[PDB]
Symmetry: C3
Subunit: 248 residues, 3 copies
């Protein structure tokens, strides 16, 4: 028996777009502590972790640790048609084969109910990278997203370069070469190594949809490792993406 | 020698857009009691009747009664180039092959004049049902339009249920099942008897575009009777759609 | 070498859009006088001539006459991602095979540096054919844009017709037959005789994007001659297009 009402559907909408950019279906892992979604893309290069804590909701009910597999195509299609400022209640009854979304005004004059069939999705091996990072940069989410889009005019690969002065995103291709250089303040570096890696812009792109959730974004880098980009969802959750670097 | 100056060309623009949704060509019945298009889609399932009473125009003139066949696709292309806040005089002359649109500024500094070829179109041998309709509902025209587009994510068929409590719009398909319920008395339901019919969303869709003319819309129903959907062009005319239900 | 710095990159963004419509590569002739593109379209029917004068730039060094072949496609692609409000400094060091654009933020938190390869651009065939222009006509550049967009629904050839009263742009095609007349209101016609040319609309449309650089535009005509359409950039240069008439 589960029931998670949220005040403003804005949140669910912005979130599902965010994880849908990375995967078609995923398991909604619901505990008394909150909804969790963990998922890897089909090329096993990059990973989403999303937590929404119990207090993120107006009302949250999850005695048992039930799981829900959900088609994020259908889910996304449906959230599309739900007003930003309407309330949205996700509920699964005791052994139904469908989850239900349920939507109302502030003023109760219109009520929408949608039902989605669930799916056996084999929960994956996957594995959050277990490391700690000796380099962290925080910056404006929207600026971040613009920088990936920028770099894409050049390549499929951005080269990030943290130093104590600031980060230096670079890229190359037929069009030419470009970099965008950032300076500390603005940007918040916390480095202890001239550490500089390369990544797939396709994914950085996908991750950067995170700016719909959070004015700021933190990137984290350990030498030769899966970087992390984190989007704080208020103080009541996070969106976390981990991506493998390109290596020789 | 027809002549028909509307004053704000928006009306003609917003109208043709609507009716063009349903049909590529249409005869304009031009009496001294106004203009009226009557027409069926090619799948002979859905009907438009629009009348602009002669009080509608700041200049009307139709001694005789003429029919004028028009390619609406071409009439639409010309009308998308016409500034909503301009004069728009229509005009046909005796044995003339061509009708003539003519726009002017408020401040008489810009004259535009287009010229379209008439068609011969076979006169329509279905026209109106002439029905009772004792079941009625009236709701904000944009919500109606939002709703048909919403229901379209689920299926090609909307099922409309009317009780005195309200009006439920339901739909089913691959994605899931959806419904949108509206409360009564903001919706003015008023029925004699509780009934529920089903319809092709394609056409409901087409009809909904009427939301650009009237802020409110009126639906009327009857058991195994082509429903009607009506849009008052304020008090100077109407646009009216009729659609066959889907029975088993 | 050459340095040229603009205060607001808006200018370059808006210029390269205009001239890229006509040709995908051009030579920038650079003097102490200023930057200067001059280029024909590949059918030798239309000619662009831009001048950015030395005072257009906050900073402009160019000791000797270098000539730079640039790929306007690529430049366009880069400039699309430069912010309007950032500055843009364009340098080239004398044996370098590369031009380099640099973009700083007013508050110095962000610096961007893109670099493009030069091209050996063979054709500088050229030849600004000045003649004595009898008739002039000057009008709001957006209206002119709009008029050609409109004339395009009819045909691919506009006939401009200039007289005491004003000017009549007309066109014909499968859709029908339109015209647009502008009274001498502003609209400063200032002719000597009646005069009626016709012109490819494709090109007129390419030209009409100049409306992003100048609230007004000016057309000059001469019997059996190329027209000129000029857009002035402040008092610091011009963009000037020349188009041959259709005769037959």
């Amino acid at each position: 028996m589960l029931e998670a009402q949220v005040q403003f559907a804005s949140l669910w909408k912005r979130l599902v777009e965010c994880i849908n950019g990375l995967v078609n279906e995923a398991n909604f892992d619901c505990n008394p502590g909150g909804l969790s979604v963990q998922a890897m893309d089909s090329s096993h290069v990059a990973l989403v972790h999303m937590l929404l804590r119990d207090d993120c909701f107006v009302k949250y009910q999850c005695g048992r640790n039930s799981i829900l597999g959900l088609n994020l195509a259908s889910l996304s299609k449906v959230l599309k048609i739900v007003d930003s400022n309407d309330s949205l209640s996700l509920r699964h009854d005791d052994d139904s084969d469908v989850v239900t979304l349920t939507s109302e005004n502030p003023e109760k004059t219109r009520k929408c109910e949608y039902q989605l069939k669930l799916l056996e999705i084999e929960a994956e091996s996957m594995g959050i990278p277990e490391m700690d990072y000796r380099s962290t940069v925080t910056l404006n989410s929207a600026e971040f997203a613009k920088i990936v889009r920028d770099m894409q005019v050049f390549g499929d690969t951005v080269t990030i370069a943290i130093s104590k002065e600031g980060v230096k995103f670079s890229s190359s291709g037929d069009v030419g070469q470009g970099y965008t250089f950032l300076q500390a303040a603005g940007v918040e570096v916390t480095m202890e190594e001239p550490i500089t890696l390369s990544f797939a812009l396709r994914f950085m792109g996908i991750f950067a949809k995170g700016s719909t959730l959070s004015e700021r974004v933190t990137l984290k880098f350990a030498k030769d490792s899966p970087c992390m980009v984190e989007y704080g969802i208020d103080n009541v959750g996070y969106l976390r993406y981990y991506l493998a670097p390109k290596v020789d």
